Every structure is written in C-alpha cells, then in structure tokens.
C-alpha cells in the first residue's frame, strides 16, 4: 500500500500549495495519514466548506495538477507575503495573487473562464482577499467597490471583499479565504473580478482511490 504522511502539510494545502506542502503538490497514495500538526494555509484564512472538500481528497488516490492557462496584462501577478516563506516572501504554489501595477492604481475589470476538457472532475479553487483596511484594499486594487463572481453550469455566487481587522495572526490582520467547486467534464467555470481575487493557476484532478486517516501512529 503506497502511503503518504502529510506531516506539517494539511490535506487541503495540497491543492493550493503553501510552503509546507511543496512536496505533496501532486502526491499519489492509497493511504493518506494526516497529523494534528498539519496546516491548510500560510496566510491567515480558511477553506469554506472545508470538511466536504476534505472527504473528497481523503478518498481521491492523490492529485494530478494541470495548468489552467489564464494569462494577464496590466496587473501584477507576483503578490507575495511574509506568512508564506520560501527563503523570502512567497505565496501559494498553485495560485496567483493579482493586484494593481502600482499602489492605488485601478485594477481592471476582468473575466476569465476555464473548461474542463479532461474526462474526470476538476477541483477548482479561488480566494477572496480581505484587506486589513479600506486604505490597504485601495493601495492594492484601487478605490471603490470590489466584486468577484463565479459561475458554473448549476452554480452562481458573488463575493464581496469586506476589509477589516481580524485578530493578528503571524502579524497579519487581513485574511484570504478559499472557495472551491468540482467542475464536471465539459463544464466551464467563469470568473469575473476587479480585485481582491486570488486566481488559481493550476487545477487538481483526482488520481484514483484511497483512504484517509488523521492518526498519531
């Protein structure tokens, strides 16, 4: 039985890729052992609907990565943070932090879509960045109201970054939370954002079949 001990890497982190998961980014296993030490994020925040996502992964057999193909012009795609350290400020290996090309510049309205062409379902994840304050949100994405919408064949949701201060974690009071859907074959997810959007760069396809356990042995 090919088996994987995620140690400091939390099962969900294999999808978005905080430093602690850099070695499981495309893991393959029949038995997934989680640890209480394991962590899903690096920047403060959580996975919404995280326990459903956890059960898909535990019984997934591993994850295969595949670029999504989004490209950009007129913004920065290299947003990084001290909370995600790779000998320096870094981020999530599978995600891009988009922001305005210069401080306070107006982030352009953007629409990007992706179609699952492979034959099994694709795990799509994206993030809302909640800034510590209105002014920081503006410095990063420009002033005014922000809106992220996500749609697939049966699903529609809008997301509104609410800047504000939450309890200082690792020195940061802002948050990035992760939302996710399962994109069936030949279906399309369509993103529409004007800032505060953490875009996926690679999608995850399940590898097969496996059992997951959070033990101490």
């Amino acid at each position: 039985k090919r088996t994987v001990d995620l140690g400091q890497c939390g099962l969900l982190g294999t999808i978005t890729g905080p430093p602690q998961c850099d070695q499981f980014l495309e893991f393959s296993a029949d038995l997934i052992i989680e640890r209480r030490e394991g962590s899903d994020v690096c920047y403060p925040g959580k996975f919404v609907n995280e326990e459903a996502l956890r059960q898909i992964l535990r019984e997934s057999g591993g994850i295969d990565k595949e670029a999504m193909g989004f490209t950009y012009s007129g913004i920065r795609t290299n947003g990084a943070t001290s909370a995600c350290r790779r000998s320096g400020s870094s981020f999530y290996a599978e995600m891009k932090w988009l922001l305005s090309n210069t401080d306070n510049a107006a982030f352009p309205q953007m629409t990007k879509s992706y179609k699952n062409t492979r034959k099994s379902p694709a795990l799509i994840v994206w993030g809302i960045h909640h800034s510590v304050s209105t002014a920081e949100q503006t410095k990063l994405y420009g002033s005014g109201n922000k809106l992220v919408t996500v749609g697939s064949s049966n699903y529609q949701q809008s997301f509104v970054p609410s800047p504000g201060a939450r309890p200082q974690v690792n020195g940061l009071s802002g948050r990035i939370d992760f939302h996710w859907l399962m994109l069936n074959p030949n279906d399309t997810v369509t993103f529409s954002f004007n800032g505060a959007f953490i875009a996926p760069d690679r999608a995850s396809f399940l590898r097969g079949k496996s059992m997951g356990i959070q033990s101490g042995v």
């Epitope: 850099d22 980014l25 670029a67 193909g69 490209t71 000998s87 290996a93």
Partner: antibody, heavy 125, light 113 residues
C-alpha cells in the same frame, strides 16, 4: 520576492570545465522549468538551454550542445550549468532564469519571467 | 530552427515621442490555443534582461501602459507610445515556441538630441 542568484563564475583556461550554480528563493522551484541564457561582451542574448521541472528532459542551444550539461537539485532549490571544453568564445555573463508558465508539455511555453543578476565567465589563457 | 529578425538595430528617439520596433519570425508563432508564443525582453544598461511583453501582447507584471505588443503569426511589433529616459536599453524579441529558443539581434533604443 522571486530571486535567482548565480554564482561560480571567474577566470578559467581554454579546455577546462567549470560549474555554475543558481540559487532560487521565492517560489516552488521544483515545479518550474529553468533556463540558462548567456551574453558575450557587446553581443545579444544567446540561449544556453532549459531543464524541465523534474529533470527528465533538457535541451541546449546550438553553440553549446555537446559540451554543456544542465541539471538541478530540487531538494536544495539549485540549478546547475556544467561547462566543458571551454573555448574563448564561451566568455559571457551567464544568466539563470525561470520558465514563468507551467503549461502542458504539448503546448510548452518557454517564456522567462524572472532573471538573475548573472555570473561572469572569462575563458582565457 | 526559428530565426528571428528584428529591425531597426538602432533607434534614436526624442524624449516624449513614440517608438516602434519590429520582429519577424521564420515560422508562425501562433499556437493552436490562439496564443502567439512571442516575448519581448528589455535590458537596461548594466542590468539583467527583464520581461516586458509575453505571449505577443500581454504587459508583464509591473510594465507601464506606454508599452504594448502586437502582431500575429510571423509579424510582431513593440510600440512605446511616449519614450521616457528610463526606457533606453536593448530590446530583444524571442520566440518561445520551439527549442532551441532563439532571440532577435536586439534593438538599441537611445535618446535623440
């Protein structure tokens, strides 16, 4: 901050070998292709070659194929260029660079989005 | 082996005036995914090259709006709408499609007086 730091250059004799290295910080090095591009004094950029993210394929430009080898230690976030049979012409700044996108092989895109500071190699007797 | 041919090789520009650089390609750079695998790099004096334009027309992280890239198939162009002093250097186009990766000869942009 994505950062590529080259090291190992200097004066070397025609016919010798020499090994350059590139330290990478800022990113999951192990998931990216990496290039070496060189530039001879007062000349254009010349591609030396590329290494895939797992080290399974390498490709080299015409003027060094046969004599240079590329390799990588993903455990230590380090890219390497092994130069052999150095000729005078090989005198150049050698730059390390990241393959920005990570697209399927059949559509592989070889853009380089981040470049190091470069390391100077002088081949001379 | 894709050959890349740039022109002009020397480009004196009066500050505040526009500038145009051309790159031709011995083979089509348009891939089947609608992308042109053509990049533009800038090398400011004494500095490393830096990404300027990727996939034919995309301004890379940090690149101001006065730059833009265009073209299709084999014919590509880099426009600077209003040249600034900080923009002098050598522009390289490079095909990103097929190994061995190859570069244009470089267009040296200088200040005109």
């Amino acid at each position: 901050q994505v950062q590529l730091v080259e090291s190992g250059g200097g004066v070397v004799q025609p016919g010798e070998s020499l090994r350059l290295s590139c330290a990478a910080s800022g990113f999951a090095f192990r998931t990216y292709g990496m290039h070496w591009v060189r530039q001879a004094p007062g000349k254009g950029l010349e591609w030396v070659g590329v290494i895939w993210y797992d080290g399974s394929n390498k490709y080299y430009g015409d003027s060094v194929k046969g004599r240079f080898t590329i390799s990588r230690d993903n455990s230590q976030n380090t890219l390497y260029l092994q130069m052999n049979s150095l000729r005078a012409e090989d005198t150049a700044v050698y730059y390390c660079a990241r393959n920005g996108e990570r697209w399927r092989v059949e559509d592989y895109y070889y853009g380089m989005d981040v470049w190091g500071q470069g390391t100077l190699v002088t081949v001379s007797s | 082996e894709i050959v890349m041919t740039q022109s002009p090789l020397s480009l004196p520009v009066t500050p505040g005036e526009p500038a145009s650089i051309s790159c031709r390609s011995s083979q089509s750079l348009l891939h089947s995914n609608a992308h042109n695998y053509l990049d533009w790099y800038l090398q400011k004096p004494g500095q490393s090259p830096q990404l300027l334009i990727y996939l034919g027309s995309n301004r890379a992280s940090g690149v101001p709006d006065r730059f833009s890239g265009s073209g299709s198939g084999t014919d590509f162009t880099l426009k600077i709408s209003r040249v600034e002093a900080e923009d002098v250097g050598i522009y390289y186009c490079m095909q990103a499609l097929q190994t061995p990766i190859t570069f244009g000869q470089g267009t040296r942009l200088e200040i005109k007086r």
